[PDB]
Amino acid sequence: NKAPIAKVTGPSTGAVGRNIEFSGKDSKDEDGKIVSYDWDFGDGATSRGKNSVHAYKKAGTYNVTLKVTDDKGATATESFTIEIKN
Ligand SMILES: [Ca+2]
């Protein structure tokens, strides 16, 4: 098996209190299927889904982590920086 490769699409800037839409659908497993897309939004919040949403309560800079898992259980991550403005 080869582990998958995580790819996040979504905004790199958003605004406080607004729902930010993220996707992991461009992630790729060369030899199988991605079976889960886990998100850590950098403010303690987590979600799961090929698409996910999060609103940040405070302006600042956050690193979002996407963790993809393939059909064999191998994992990969991406760290993606988002700026949240007032
Ligand atoms: Ca694989």
Author numbering: 795 to 880
Article sentences:
Clostridial collagenases are among the most efficient enzymes to degrade by far the most predominant protein in the biosphere. Clostridia employ collagenases for nutrition (e.g. saprophytic strains) and host colonization (1–3). They are large multidomain proteins of ∼115 kDa belonging to the gluzincin superfamily of metalloproteases. Here we present the crystal structures of the peptidase domains of ColH and ColT and the collagenase unit of ColG in the presence and absence of the peptidic inhibitor isoamylphosphonyl-Gly-Pro-Ala bound to the active site.
Although the previously reported ColG crystals contained the PKD-like domain in addition to the collagenase unit, the PKD-like domain remained largely disordered. This disorder is presumably related to the presence of citrate in the crystallization buffer, which titrates away Ca2+ ions. Because the crystal packing did not tolerate rebuffering to introduce calcium, we produced and crystallized an isolated PKD-like domain spanning residues Asn795–Asn880 to investigate its calcium-binding properties. To verify the proposed calcium binding site in the PKD-like domain, the crystal structure of an N-terminally extended construct of the PKD-like domain of ColG (Asn795–Asn880) was determined in the presence of 10 mm calcium at 0.99 Å resolution. In this orthorhombic crystal form, we identified six proteinaceous ligands, namely Asn795, Lys796, Asp825, Asp864, and both of the carboxylate oxygens of Asp823, which together with a seventh water ligand coordinate the calcium ion in a pentagonal-bipyramidal geometry. In addition, an N-terminally further extended PKD construct (Ile792–Asn880) was crystallized in the same conditions as the Asn795–Asn880, but the additional residues (Ile792, Ser793, and Asn794) could not be traced in the electron density, indicating their flexibility even in the presence of calcium (data not shown). Notably, in both PKD variants (Ile792–Asn880 and Asn795–Asn880), the calcium could not be extracted by incubating the respective crystals for up to 4 h with 100 mm EDTA.
